[PDB]
Design a protein around this ligand. Structure first.
Ligand SMILES: Nc1ncnc2c1ncn2[C@@H]1O[C@H](COP(=O)(O)OP(=O)(O)OC[C@H]2O[C@@H]([n+]3cccc(C(=O)O)c3)[C@H](O)[C@@H]2O)[C@@H](O)[C@H]1O
Ligand SMILES: Nc1ncnc2c1ncn2[C@@H]1O[C@H](COP(=O)(O)OP(=O)(O)OC[C@H]2O[C@@H]([n+]3cccc(C(=O)O)c3)[C@H](O)[C@@H]2O)[C@@H](O)[C@H]1O
Ligand SMILES: Nc1ncnc2c1ncn2[C@@H]1O[C@H](COP(=O)(O)OP(=O)(O)OC[C@H]2O[C@@H]([n+]3cccc(C(=O)O)c3)[C@H](O)[C@@H]2O)[C@@H](O)[C@H]1O
Ligand SMILES: Nc1ncnc2c1ncn2[C@@H]1O[C@H](COP(=O)(O)OP(=O)(O)OC[C@H]2O[C@@H]([n+]3cccc(C(=O)O)c3)[C@H](O)[C@@H]2O)[C@@H](O)[C@H]1O
Lengths: 212, 212, 213, 213
């Protein structure tokens, strides 16, 4: 029988885009392809407002847009927990929290784009103990992205290369490089982003005067 | 005052995708940017079933999917005329027909991706007299595409370079290279194409057993 | 053991670029990775000057630039035969010629980008019987390109599908979409194309005043 | 008339690739096209071996490969100073050093890809005062890269926005997303990387057994 899996994507989602969404679909299809898993749920967890130097739209707006984006999904949902904490939280702690909730046992895996794996290499960015826990205790499903070589990142990381059974590389056969930064700039300039992000998200953005 | 413009996109739309749709949005924003035009309507005209060697889904299905895709557009519509003719028709004749309908005067311009301009160079593909009429009588709005150099195609074409006032190059700042061929293959394999094409189009495809 | 293979690339090479050369390397590694082939040579065959609607630099120059580009390759050479003929020649005929030239005999395969595979679909472009002879009697090695889906092209063409075993899809996880059209325009504007095409080619272009506005 | 400019590129260059070199050419043409600058030199400065978490080839080798790659450039040279220091050094300090070296004086600007511009946003990575001195006292020339939106990065950073006149966005209408990570993995697998990095670099790599699995 197949192992039940829940995919957790942590990120800014400022705003959520069709690209972030496609990431779940490709990841799910990949895991199902292996024959060993049965993805049962997808979770979008927007980062807290105290994170980073960049000024994101308020967390309640990012959760609301993600929710609207997912109204048309029958397996992916947004979870505000992380954004509703008083402070930013390292991702491994978000995995721990969501794992606990699952026990109130499916496997919880972190879902991310290849650019994320590359940040594992950034000085003082991620704790090595955390990278190890993520791939050893939970699991990692990485979706390809132009200009990134996931296989190489894994091979060159002493930590990742020792936990490949728990790392799944899902290749993106389509060229999808739509930047959220670009989306925000286009909106600020009054230009269309239709067909780049869900219509409901576009409406919400207009209604609430976001990115202007 | 601004010159009223109607954009006509001729193609297979087998099926229509978010990329084909984004093409209209970018083209419209570009023309509006110049300050000289006011795009009043967009028209998707699916090619007839006798065209080419490739086996397309029946024209009534392609029109139906385009219609569903456009239900959420307030300015773009599908026009079945071309696909409802007994035989394939050169594009200039589709422009002539739609121009006549406009008179029962806005400017009618052909909308296409950069790869189209490149086919103008294919031996025995397009009649030179037709390429001239399209750019001289109507106009051409070209949206960028990875691997294509529209400025060079124009400069190297004796015909195009003499009619640049009627050619508008709209640059696509986003990397959007989602192939319809890939979409069809993914669907045939039972894989998701959600977030690549509109949900309503996906539903229609399933309902009518298309691309299987 | 491994069967010998010669790769033939027909195209404009106006001018030959690093991308065109990369195609040969990717294809060879791919064929070797299958374990059944041993690529022994690559051939660059610039198209005749009567070809198409686009003005190409003289074949004399395109052959020269390819030769100079290939001076640093130990397995790929340029062959001017096709360009020296009185007129343009269908690709199947160039394959036939080079096959005879080879005549326990190595297999000659057409090397091309995925885009060319898409052109097989173009009405009145390639004769169906030629596409058939190309994939059946020779073989095709196709290198991936952004925006193209070679697997789908093959599945949607009855001819390609039937002879798919003779079609080798090589994929390069790299994005190398550098068009020769852009190369020519940049050169005409006095901009650099260094590191996009070989230094020897840029030298020849400058020395012979090619691609000037 | 035009003010003289020296371009400084700090990075790993593990190994230097055609893409890294292309960056210099695109940036120079861009600056010249503005009409107010005259690029007189480019400098490749490989990072110190104590840098980061990733294992890099020895700086001795990275400097050597850059020198060999640049033998065919008449304006870009490699400078080992940064890599010869006892430890990693913040980029603003390397700029300060090379500026003093120049000391009616040319302007020294940091040359980088758009991705580096995005790293300015990374928490605890770049000191805000350094980002400020880099864009105000030196200048930044950024080359576009797929998936990045330099214009938005600048608009969203108060510091960058305030000194945007000293940030030059160069765009190359070409897709050249060839990662050095892929280059290293391919080399470790015995695959070709010819036409992705300079022939002289491949020779050095083979001769010194670099990037072996
Ligand atoms: N075109 C595309 N194709 C495929 N994937 C794409 C994509 N665009 C975005 N993505 C993916 O979308 C996801 C979210 O993107 P985005 O909204 O930009 O989110 P982003 O800012 O990239 O997310 C940063 C996340 O990492 C966490 N973090 C950072 C640093 C250290 C630690 C720690 O625990 O020590 C944790 C942080 O708390 C936050 O959850 C990413 O996984 C990205 O790769
Ligand atoms: N990712 C993307 N980014 C930007 N644009 C994109 C795109 N994907 C498709 N497109 C554009 O979508 C449009 C439709 O695409 P697709 O569905 O593939 O349609 P396609 O098969 O490329 O369309 C062929 C059209 O050209 C006409 N034609 C061909 C040859 C000769 C003559 C003549 O009159 O002599 C006429 C033909 O009747 C038909 O209307 C194209 O303009 C394409 O460039
Ligand atoms: N970035 C890139 N990545 C991978 N491959 C890339 C590439 N850029 C070009 N290429 C490849 O380079 C090669 C040469 O490119 P280019 O210089 O543009 O050559 P191109 O003009 O595309 O070559 C046309 C060729 O097809 C032949 N043809 C056409 C139509 C009908 C028939 C017939 O026999 O009926 C024959 C014609 O005789 C000529 O040899 C192509 O195979 C192209 O796919
Ligand atoms: N395809 C492509 N198109 C355009 N540009 C491309 C490229 N591939 C790489 N590049 C560019 O090549 C250059 C070198 O690449 P790579 O070899 O990967 O170098 P990389 O590891 O990205 O360089 C990091 C550099 O940033 C410095 N840094 C980092 C963090 C904090 C601080 C500080 O002072 O606080 C300084 C560090 O000392 C080092 O010099 C980069 O500018 C990159 O953007």
């Amino acid at each position: 029988s197949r192992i039940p899996v829940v995919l957790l994507a942590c990120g800014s989602f400022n705003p959520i885009t069709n690209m972030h969404l496609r990431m779940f679909e490709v990841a799910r299809d990949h895991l199902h392809q292996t024959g060993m898993y049965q993805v049962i749920q997808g979770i979008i967890s927007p980062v807290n407002d105290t994170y980073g130097k960049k000024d994101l739209a308020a967390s309640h707006h990012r959760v609301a847009m993600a929710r609207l984006a997912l109204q048309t999904s029958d397996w992916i949902r947004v979870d505000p927990w992380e954004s509703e904490q008083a402070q930013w939280m390292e991702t491994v702690k978000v995995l721990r929290h969501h794992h606990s909730k699952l026990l109130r046992v499916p496997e919880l895996k972190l879902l991310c784009g290849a650019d994320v794996l590359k940040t594992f290499q950034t000085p003082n960015l991620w704790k090595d103990a955390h990278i190890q826990e993520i791939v050893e205790k939970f699991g990692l499903v990485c979706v390809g992205r132009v200009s990134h070589d996931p296989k190489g990142y894994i091979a060159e990381s002493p930590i990742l290369r020792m936990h490949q059974h728990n790392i799944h590389l899902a290749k993106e056969p389509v060229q999808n490089e739509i930047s959220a930064t670009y989306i925000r700039r286009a909106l600020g300039q009054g230009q269309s982003v239709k067909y780049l992000i869900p219509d409901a998200v576009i409406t919400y953005i207009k209604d609430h005067g976001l990115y202007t």
